[PDB]
Design a protein around this motif. Structure first.
Motif, PDB file in Angstrom:
ATOM      1  N   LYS A  50       0.859  -1.176   0.000  1.00  0.00           N
ATOM      2  CA  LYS A  50       0.000   0.000   0.000  1.00  0.00           C
ATOM      3  C   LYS A  50       0.890   1.219   0.000  1.00  0.00           C
ATOM      4  CE  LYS A  50      -4.033   1.973   2.257  1.00  0.00           C
ATOM      5  NZ  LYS A  50      -5.347   1.625   2.843  1.00  0.00           N
ATOM      6  N   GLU A  95     -11.807  -8.391  -4.100  1.00  0.00           N
ATOM      7  CA  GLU A  95     -12.787  -7.760  -3.230  1.00  0.00           C
ATOM      8  C   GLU A  95     -14.057  -8.544  -3.153  1.00  0.00           C
ATOM      9  OE1 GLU A  95     -13.548  -3.791  -4.568  1.00  0.00           O
ATOM     10  OE2 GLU A  95     -11.372  -3.311  -4.591  1.00  0.00           O
ATOM     11  N   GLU A 138     -15.590  -3.348  -0.467  1.00  0.00           N
ATOM     12  CA  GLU A 138     -14.364  -2.900  -1.095  1.00  0.00           C
ATOM     13  C   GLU A 138     -13.182  -3.091  -0.120  1.00  0.00           C
ATOM     14  OE1 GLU A 138     -17.557  -1.285  -1.024  1.00  0.00           O
ATOM     15  OE2 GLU A 138     -17.421   0.508  -2.290  1.00  0.00           O
ATOM     16  N   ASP A 155      -7.722  -1.823   4.878  1.00  0.00           N
ATOM     17  CA  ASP A 155      -7.999  -0.359   4.920  1.00  0.00           C
ATOM     18  C   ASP A 155      -8.255   0.038   6.352  1.00  0.00           C
ATOM     19  OD1 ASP A 155      -8.658   2.436   4.308  1.00  0.00           O
ATOM     20  OD2 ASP A 155      -9.541   1.861   2.341  1.00  0.00           O
TER      21      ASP A 155
HETATM   22  N1  LIG Z   1      -3.517  -7.099   0.442  1.00  0.00           N
HETATM   23  C1  LIG Z   1      -4.232  -6.873  -0.679  1.00  0.00           C
HETATM   24  N2  LIG Z   1      -4.419  -7.805  -1.627  1.00  0.00           N
HETATM   25  C2  LIG Z   1      -5.156  -7.591  -2.739  1.00  0.00           C
HETATM   26  N3  LIG Z   1      -5.735  -6.408  -3.007  1.00  0.00           N
HETATM   27  C3  LIG Z   1      -5.610  -5.385  -2.119  1.00  0.00           C
HETATM   28  C4  LIG Z   1      -4.835  -5.550  -0.894  1.00  0.00           C
HETATM   29  N4  LIG Z   1      -4.876  -4.391  -0.221  1.00  0.00           N
HETATM   30  C5  LIG Z   1      -5.638  -3.564  -0.936  1.00  0.00           C
HETATM   31  N5  LIG Z   1      -6.062  -4.159  -2.065  1.00  0.00           N
HETATM   32  C6  LIG Z   1      -6.859  -3.555  -3.144  1.00  0.00           C
HETATM   33  O1  LIG Z   1      -6.611  -2.147  -3.123  1.00  0.00           O
HETATM   34  C7  LIG Z   1      -7.799  -1.468  -2.747  1.00  0.00           C
HETATM   35  C8  LIG Z   1      -7.461  -0.253  -1.918  1.00  0.00           C
HETATM   36  O2  LIG Z   1      -6.791  -0.607  -0.725  1.00  0.00           O
HETATM   37  P1  LIG Z   1      -7.190   0.138   0.646  1.00  0.00           P
HETATM   38  O3  LIG Z   1      -6.216  -0.336   1.693  1.00  0.00           O
HETATM   39  O4  LIG Z   1      -8.668  -0.021   0.761  1.00  0.00           O
HETATM   40  O5  LIG Z   1      -6.755   1.678   0.460  1.00  0.00           O
HETATM   41  P2  LIG Z   1      -7.729   2.964   0.390  1.00  0.00           P
HETATM   42  O6  LIG Z   1      -7.717   3.473   1.826  1.00  0.00           O
HETATM   43  O7  LIG Z   1      -6.911   3.974  -0.388  1.00  0.00           O
HETATM   44  O8  LIG Z   1      -8.977   2.390  -0.214  1.00  0.00           O
HETATM   45  C9  LIG Z   1      -8.613  -2.483  -2.047  1.00  0.00           C
HETATM   46  O9  LIG Z   1      -9.986  -2.158  -2.058  1.00  0.00           O
HETATM   47  C10 LIG Z   1      -8.291  -3.736  -2.822  1.00  0.00           C
HETATM   48  O10 LIG Z   1      -8.982  -3.863  -4.053  1.00  0.00           O
END
Ligand SMILES: Nc1ncnc2c1ncn2[C@@H]1O[C@H](COP(=O)(O)OP(=O)(O)O)[C@@H](O)[C@H]1O
Ligand SMILES: [Ca+2]
Ligand SMILES: [Ca+2]
Ligand SMILES: [Ca+2]
Ligand SMILES: [Ca+2]
Ligand SMILES: [Mg+2]
Length: 459
Positions: A50, A95, A138, A155
């Protein structure tokens, strides 16, 4: 008494992100950056990084406190002039949102399983004074592509600590999923319940319970609190499922069910494991003897940071089943019932069991395995201990663990390095004494890769 926790192992690195990782593809983009599938440059192991454009110590700090089978794992993190990088476990099932827009509607079985796990995650969070504040499909991932894949919460960027005494004011969340009290400005952890209640409604029906032409229209609908089971798809659904939904979307916070209690709802319970696997896991747990701190950190590190998801799937199921109350911690009584449950599975006779002998049996296991001495066996402690020691103490894992301990690359673990691993200024001469006395071979004041190897290799 230095507490070994997975979290202590995530350190603010002093290498550059790009010195240790390589981007592969984008998994998702967020409001202020994107999550990028990376490979460790040495071992080709895959993480989800991230990335957060400074143009947040807190998302990292909350995550170090959490260790739960349905909560996202943090490995380490880097900071840049322009950026933070949070190295996370990748969950390859994508998701819940996608699966929702795909399968359209969920089986009561599948919905209960999903919701049970979410509720377990937050019950655990709530126990640790942490509120998520932004639960939605999400921000829930399926671990892998398997049919009935495990669920992970992610998140934690809007999440925060809460105190039972004061209440939160900040308006945070997402229109469909935000609880009315959050709009009004005085709220507590029950907002996470409301969100989960919304999510449950969606899973079972395909539709949000509060809708509108646009954001504003939705928030009005939300803030009114009124929802209906007037849609055709609900004729199929059992009353108990609706009952839980009603309790989770109870308008008034104090009347609304907690996560903790929601786990006990009839619906979630009413709706598998090879005896051999259970047997081995319980055997592996019973045979773990506590030991000096260097070994403890090493094992917990190997368990908590160096095992893949693929490696822990059996172990993950077992834990959630041994956790009768779902709260993400195994206690004396749950552990007792695991042994008993296994005894039933082997035909043994209940009455023919010495409950107090088992209780003593379990008091000692707990003493051995409870790495952080908080009176509970948590997921990573479980994994470290329950995994087959030849599998866990693979030649790779061993090499990689020592590498991490020996910070200055010197090929020897010093007490200072040990203190660093723990996150403490130095280690008690007494505890370091207790270490060498059991590990030092050459006799030189330090632990090298052979000394290390034998320490754990005595399985
Ligand atoms: N560990 C992970 N594995 C697969 N996809 C991820 C992972 N972390 C995040 N994502 C994808 O990235 C998106 C955004 O991550 P998130 O941590 O929700 O950040 P934000 O706060 O910017 O939404 C998630 O909704 C998901 O689709
Ligand atoms: Ca429990
Ligand atoms: Ca513990
Ligand atoms: Ca060293
Ligand atoms: Ca030595
Ligand atoms: Mg998100």
């Amino acid at each position: 008494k230095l507490a070994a926790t997975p979290g202590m192992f995530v350190q603010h690195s002093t290498a550059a992100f790009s010195d240790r990782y390589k981007g592969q593809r984008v998994l998702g983009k967020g409001s202020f950056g994107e999550v990028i599938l990376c490979k460790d440059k040495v071992t080709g192991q895959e993480y989800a990084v991230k990335v957060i454009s400074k143009r947040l110590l807190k998302e990292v700090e909350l995550l170090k406190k959490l260790d739960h089978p349905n909560i996202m794992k943090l490995y380490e993190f880097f900071e840049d002039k322009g950026y933070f990088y949070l190295v996370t476990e990748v969950y390859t099932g994508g998701e819940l949102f996608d699966e929702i827009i795909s399968r359209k509607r969920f089986s009561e079985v599948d919905a209960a399983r999903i919701i049970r796990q979410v509720l377990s995650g937050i019950t655990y969070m709530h126990k640790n004074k942490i509120v998520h504040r932004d639960l939605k499909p999400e921000n829930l991932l399926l671990e892998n592509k398997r049919k009935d894949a495990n669920i992970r919460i992610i998140d934690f960027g809007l999440s925060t600590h809460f105190e039972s005494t004061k209440k939160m004011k900040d308006k945070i969340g997402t229109a469909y999923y935000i609880a009315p009290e959050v709009l009004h400005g005085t709220y507590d952890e029950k907002c996470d319940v409301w969100s989960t209640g919304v999510i449950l409604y969606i899973l079972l029906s395909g539709c949000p319970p509060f809708n509108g032409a646009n954001e504003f229209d939705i928030l009005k609908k939300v803030e009114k609190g009124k929802f209906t089971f007037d849609l055709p798809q609900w004729k199929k659904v059992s009353e108990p499922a609706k009952d839980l939904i009603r309790k989770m979307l109870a308008y008034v916070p104090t009347m609304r069910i907690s996560a903790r209690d929601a786990l006990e709802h009839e619906w979630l319970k009413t709706t598998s494991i090879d005896v051999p696997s259970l047997e081995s896991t319980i055997l592996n747990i019973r045979q773990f003897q506590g030991t000096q701190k260097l070994a403890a950190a090493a094992l917990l590190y190997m368990g908590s940071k160096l095992t893949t998801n693929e490696e822990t799937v059996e172990l993950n199921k077992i834990f959630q089943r041994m956790d009768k109350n779902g709260d993400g911690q195994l206690d004396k009584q749950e552990l007792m019932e695991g042994y008993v449950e296994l005894m039933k599975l082997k035909g043994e006779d209940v009455s023919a069991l010495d409950q107090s002998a088992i209780e003593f049996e379990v008091e000692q296991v707990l003493d051995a395995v409870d790495f952080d001495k908080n009176g509970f066996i948590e997921y990573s402690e479980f994994v470290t201990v329950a995994m087959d020691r030849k599998t866990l103490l693979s030649r790779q894992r061993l090499e990689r663990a020592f590498g991490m301990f020996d910070a200055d690359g010197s090929g020897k673990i010093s007490s200072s390095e040990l203190a660093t691993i723990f996150g403490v200024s130095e280690v008690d001469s007494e505890t370091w004494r207790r270490v060498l006395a059991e590990v030092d071979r050459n006799n030189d004041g330090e632990v090298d890769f052979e000394e290390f190897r034998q320490m754990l290799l005595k399985l």
